[PDB]
Design a binder for this molecule. Sequence first.
Ligand SMILES: O=P(O)(O)OC[C@H]1O[C@](O)(CO)[C@@H](O)[C@@H]1O
Ligand SMILES: O=P(O)(O)OC[C@H]1O[C@](O)(CO)[C@@H](O)[C@@H]1O
Ligand SMILES: O=P(O)(O)OC[C@H]1O[C@](O)(CO)[C@@H](O)[C@@H]1O
Ligand SMILES: O=P(O)(O)OC[C@H]1O[C@](O)(CO)[C@@H](O)[C@@H]1O
Ligand SMILES: [Mg+2]
Ligand SMILES: [Mg+2]
Ligand SMILES: [Mg+2]
Ligand SMILES: [Mg+2]
Ligand SMILES: [Mg+2]
Ligand SMILES: [Mg+2]
Lengths: 311, 319, 319, 311
Amino acid sequence: HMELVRVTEAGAMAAGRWVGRGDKEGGDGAAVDAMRELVNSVSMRGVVVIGEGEKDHAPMLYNGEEVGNGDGPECDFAVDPIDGATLMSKGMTNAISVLAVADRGTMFDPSAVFYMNKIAVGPDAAHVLDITAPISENIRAVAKVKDLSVRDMTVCILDRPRHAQLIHDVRATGARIRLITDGDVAGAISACRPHSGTDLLAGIGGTPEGIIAAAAIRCMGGAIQAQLAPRDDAERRKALEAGYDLNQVLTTEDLVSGENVFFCATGVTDGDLLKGVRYYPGGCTTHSIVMRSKSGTVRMIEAYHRLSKLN
Amino acid sequence: HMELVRVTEAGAMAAGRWVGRGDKEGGDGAAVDAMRELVNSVSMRGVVVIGEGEKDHAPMLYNGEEVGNGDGPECDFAVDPIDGATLMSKGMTNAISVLAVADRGTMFDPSAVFYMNKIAVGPDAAHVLDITAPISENIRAVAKVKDLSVRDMTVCILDRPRHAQLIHDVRATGARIRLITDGDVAGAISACRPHSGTDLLAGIGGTPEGIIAAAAIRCMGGAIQAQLAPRDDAERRKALEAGYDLNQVLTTEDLVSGENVFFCATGVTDGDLLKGVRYYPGGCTTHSIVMRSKSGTVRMIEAYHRLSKLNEYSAIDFT
Amino acid sequence: HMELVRVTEAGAMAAGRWVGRGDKEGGDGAAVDAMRELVNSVSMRGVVVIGEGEKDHAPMLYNGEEVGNGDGPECDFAVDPIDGATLMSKGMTNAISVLAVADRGTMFDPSAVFYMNKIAVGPDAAHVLDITAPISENIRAVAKVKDLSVRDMTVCILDRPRHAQLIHDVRATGARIRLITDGDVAGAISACRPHSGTDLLAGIGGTPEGIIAAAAIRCMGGAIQAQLAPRDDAERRKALEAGYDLNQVLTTEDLVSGENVFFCATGVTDGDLLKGVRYYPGGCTTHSIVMRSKSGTVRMIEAYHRLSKLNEYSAIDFT
Amino acid sequence: HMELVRVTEAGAMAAGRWVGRGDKEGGDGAAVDAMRELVNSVSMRGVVVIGEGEKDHAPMLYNGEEVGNGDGPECDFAVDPIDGATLMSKGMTNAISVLAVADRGTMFDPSAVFYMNKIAVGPDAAHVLDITAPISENIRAVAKVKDLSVRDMTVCILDRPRHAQLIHDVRATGARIRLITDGDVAGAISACRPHSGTDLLAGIGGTPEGIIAAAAIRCMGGAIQAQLAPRDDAERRKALEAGYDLNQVLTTEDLVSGENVFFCATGVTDGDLLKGVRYYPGGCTTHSIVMRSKSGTVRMIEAYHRLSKLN
Ligand SMILES: O=P(O)(O)OC[C@H]1O[C@](O)(CO)[C@@H](O)[C@@H]1O
Ligand SMILES: O=P(O)(O)OC[C@H]1O[C@](O)(CO)[C@@H](O)[C@@H]1O
Ligand SMILES: O=P(O)(O)OC[C@H]1O[C@](O)(CO)[C@@H](O)[C@@H]1O
Ligand SMILES: O=P(O)(O)OC[C@H]1O[C@](O)(CO)[C@@H](O)[C@@H]1O
Ligand SMILES: [Mg+2]
Ligand SMILES: [Mg+2]
Ligand SMILES: [Mg+2]
Ligand SMILES: [Mg+2]
Ligand SMILES: [Mg+2]
Ligand SMILES: [Mg+2]
C-alpha cells in the first residue's frame, strides 16, 4: 500500500515543472494527468469521490470515475493534484499534492454543501475541541493543554473577507495568526503535526478539503470538527431536504468513517511539512508523507529518482 | 563580532509577538525598541546611517542617532527592524530582522532617492551582470555562465504594477518567477546564496534595502548592480540638484565600500533561509545568519532562549 | 516493491530490544524470527540463497528455505538479520538489518569459500578498480579520477590482524582510514554513496556480505571487485574441487547478475547512513533505505511505529 | 562571549586534519596548539585549571598557565582539546573539542582523585537522581518520569573491565546499553540532550571530564552526581587528609559553583550531537554548541570558513 506514494510523487513531479511559470491550468492539468496515469497502474479498485469535479467539466478524475488495476476491494478515492494551484504558479510556499483512500461509501459526501467551517488541532489537545464555542475559548483551552501562553499560540486561517470577524476575534485574544492565501489541507495537517509552527486551524474552507484532511487525521491523530456552511438560503434548503441537521457537529470519523484509511502527500513547493521537488541533471528528489489508520504508522519518504544517466 | 546577532534576535523576538496581529507599526515599534536597547549595550560606536528615517518622522533609530555604549571605532550602522512589516502583520513567510555594520562614512546615502533599480546574483555569475541591458539578456548571460538551462532559472521579483513588463519579459524568456509581496533584502540574499532555489533578483525596490543587501553581498560573495529610480520629475531634479549622476551604474562596493563589513539577520516568520521565531513551553527558538567580509566566514546560528527558569521545563530539540 | 522495507524494519525493531545486552544470539534470533514472519506475508515466492546457514546448523532462514506467501515469480532471496551481531550486543555504531532480492538463480553461491577479498567504490571511480593491484595504486587511481588529493581519501577497513599490511599501505599512501570492528556491508554502501565521507572499502570480509553489498551496488551505482580468499590449503582444494577459478576477478554482476535487483536496510544502532531504532512514549522510529536496480530510484524512509493506541500519546517529530 | 566558540572551532579544525591517520599525539598536539594560539587572542584573564596536565610534562595548557588577552576578570579555564584522542585517530564517532569557563576558584579541584563515579540525566528527570541507590532504581525512576518502559531506556557506559558489575546490573534490569570506548564528556552531554538516543550516563570516568560536563549541565539543565573513586588506599588516604568526605555526593553545583559559567564544544568526528568538521576546496564547515548559565541560552552554530578563494 505504500506504493500509492508514487501517485503524489508523479503529481508533484509534473506540477514541479510548472512551478513559477504563472500558468495555473498548465501545472494543475499536468498534475492531474500524471496522477491519473499512475493510479491506473496500481493494484486497486477505486471510484473517485473527490477530484476535479463532475465529468461534464472534468475529463480526468471526475466524480465516479473508476481508477486502478481493477484488482482488490472497491474503495473510495479522494485526490487533490494541487491543494491551491495559485501557490504553484506564483512560486509560493506550502503547495502539496494529495491523495486519500478509504472503504467504499465511508467518505462524507463532498457535494452536499460547498463550504464547511473547520477547526483542527493535534493529538495532545484534540480532546478539548468544541467548534460551537467561541474561537477564544478554543484557543485558551488548547493553549493550556499545550502548556503555552495564549500569546505563544499560532492560528492558521485562510485570508478571506469572510474571515474578517474570525480574524478580529483571534487577534483580540492575543494569539498570533498565520494567514494563508490557499491550501487548508496543508494548513490542517500542519496544525496537527508537532513543531510545525502552527497550533490550530480555524475557519471556513472547501468541504472536499475538509474530508481529505480528516483522512489524514484518521491516520496520524488529532481532531478536526466541522459544520456545513451554506452560502445562501437555496443551498441551506437543499441541504435540509437532503437530510442534514445543520446543528450537527461533524467529528473526524463523520467525515471519513472507514476502518482502512490511507493518506499520502508530496511537496510541490517548499512548505512547513515537506520540501518541494528539486530537479538535478541526473534526476530529481521528492519529499512525501504516507500514513495508514489501521497501524497508525507514519512514514516520511525522500525519493531520489534517476530518469537518465548522463555523460 | 558575533555578539551583534543578539540585536536581530532581540528584534525578531519582539516582533514575534505581533505576527499576524494586523498592526504593522506596533510590530515595527516593538522591534525598533528592542534592537535599540540591545545595540546600546554592545561595544561599538556607531552612527545610524540607515534607520527608521529622519529625526522628526522617526522617534527611534533616526538618521544620525548615535548607538552603542560609547567605545569602539566609530562606524556606519544600518538596521531594518523588519524587512516588510506587512509580512509580519499578516503572518506571511520570509519576514526577517536585519542589521549591517561597516567602516564610518562607507555607506551610500539612502536619502538620495527613494527607489533603486536592482539586479543581484551569486558569485558564480558576479561579473556577467548589466543592469542597463534588458532582463532577458541578463537571464541568458547568467544561465550560460552557470551551464544551466534558461528554463531552469528562477527570478525573485516584487509583485507590483510597476513590474508588469519585467515579469512578462522573464516569463517570455522561459525562466521561472518567485513572486514576493514584500522583502527584497531577503530576496537579494536568497539569489546570492548558492543552493537556494533562487538564481536572480531583479526590479525596483527601496534604496535603503538595496544598500543593506549590498552589505550582505559584500560578505557572502556575488554582486548587485543598481541605478537610482526617481518617481517623478520633481524627485529627478531633487536628485540631480544634489550632484547625482542618474546614469551611473552603482556596484556592490559603491553602495558599501569599507573592508570591515558585518551583516546579520534573524527570522521573524518562516522563510526560505531562516525559520521564524518558534514558541515552546519554556521559551523560544530563533534562527539567524551572521557574516563578515574580512574573513568571509558565514555562520548559521540557532538559539533557544529560556523565558525563563533553570530546568523547570522539558528539553527542546532543534533544526 | 517498497513493502519489503517492513522486513528490515521488523528485523531492526526486534533487534532493538537487545542492543547492548551482550547476547549476540538472542538479538540475531529475535531479528531472524521477526523477518521470517514478515517475509512470509509479502507477495513474493523466494528461496533463501543467503541466510543463517545450512539446514542443520540454522533452524530459521536456512539455505534453500522457501519464503513468501506463495505467489509471485520465484526469485533469489538474501537476508542478513544484523550485519555484525557484536555491534548490536555491545550497543556500538553502524549495525544494520539487510535484505536483498534478485531474479532466481542470479546470486553467486555463498558457500564456495568463507572469505573474499574486496574493494568497492562509488560510480565516479567505478571503472578504475583493480583488486590485483596493491591498495596504494588503487587509492591513487581513485583519487585522480575524482580530482581529489590522496591525503583527502578515506578507506573503510575492518580492524583485523590479517589487515596489518593493508592498513600500513593505506597510511603510507597518505590516505585516511575509518577503522570498523564489524560490518562491511554498511562499509561497502558507505564507500559507494557519493557524499558519505568514505571513498573506498578494502579488505577481506565474508563472502555472503560481499554478495549482499553487490546487490546494493547494483541498484545505487558504483562497483565492487572481489576474489575468493581460502583460509588454508584444505579450503583451497575444497574450492578448487568445485570448479572455482581462484584467480578470477569477480565483478558486481558476477556476484548478482539479474536485472531486477532489490535492496533495503534499516538502522539497528546509529550509523553514518541510518539512525538506529529510537524509542518514545508512544512507540519508536526506524530509519531505512530502499533501492531498485530497474529504476535506479533510492528511497530514504523514516517511520514512526505506534506501539500502540490512536492519539493517547503526544506527537513525535522526525529526522 | 560567544567568541569563545572560535577556540573549539580552531581545535576541531586542527584535529580534523589528523582524523583517521592513526596518530593520537599528532592530532591531539595539533589541537592543543591551535586552541592555545586562539585563546590568547581572546579578551579574557584566565588560568588553566583543567588541561593537558602539570607543566613538567605539558608545555601548553598546563595547570596554572595564564591565558587570554589579559583584559577582564580572572576566571577558571577548563579545556579538553579532544575528549578521547583515539576516536580521532581511528576515524570513530563522537570525538569533540571542548572548553568551559567559570568564576575563578569555582571549579572543583581536578587533582584530588583521578576517577569519580558518575550519573547524569537531562532536565526532565534530574530530580530523581540518587547515585547512592542501585543503578536499577535510578533506571526505573528515570524511565517512569520520561514515560518510557525500562526496556526503552538506553544507558551510556564506558567499556571498561571496571564496569563489569555495572554492565551486568544494567542488563539485568532490561535496559539497553550504549558502550563507548572513550569520551564521557560527550556521553554526559548526550544523556542530557533530548532526542539524542541516550537517556542516562553511568559509571566511573575521569574527574576532570566530570567537571567539564558539570559546566555544560550548569548551562543547559539536567543533573550530574558524582563521588570520588580512589584507585588504591594511598589515593584514598591522600583524599581523606586533603579534607574530603568520601560519603559525600557531589551535585552539579559542587563541581562548578560559579554564577557565570560558559561552555562550548565543536565536533571533530560525527557524533550524536555535532557533525564532524568537513573540508571542501573553498574551505570547511564546523558544527558547534555554545551555552551560558546566566541566561540559559543554548546556541547551535554551523560555521562556513573561507580560508582561500580559488580559480
Ligand atoms: O478559495 P475559496 O473559495 O475561499 O475556498 C478555499 C479553498 O480553496 C483552496 O485554497 C484551494 O482550492 C482550498 O485549500 C480551500 O479549502
Ligand atoms: O513597497 P514598495 O513601495 O513597492 O517598495 C519595495 C520595498 O518595500 C519592502 O518590500 C518592505 O518595505 C522592501 O523589501 C522593498 O525594498
Ligand atoms: O569477523 P571476520 O571473521 O573477520 O569477517 C568479517 C565479516 O564479519 C562481519 O563483520 C559481521 O559478521 C561482516 O560484516 C564481515 O563480512
Ligand atoms: O580511559 P580511562 O582511564 O578508563 O578513563 C576514562 C576517561 O578517558 C576518556 O575516555 C578520554 O581521556 C574520558 O572521556 C574518560 O573520562
Ligand atoms: Mg484543494
Ligand atoms: Mg524593509
Ligand atoms: Mg541563490
Ligand atoms: Mg553480517
Ligand atoms: Mg562514498
Ligand atoms: Mg577527555
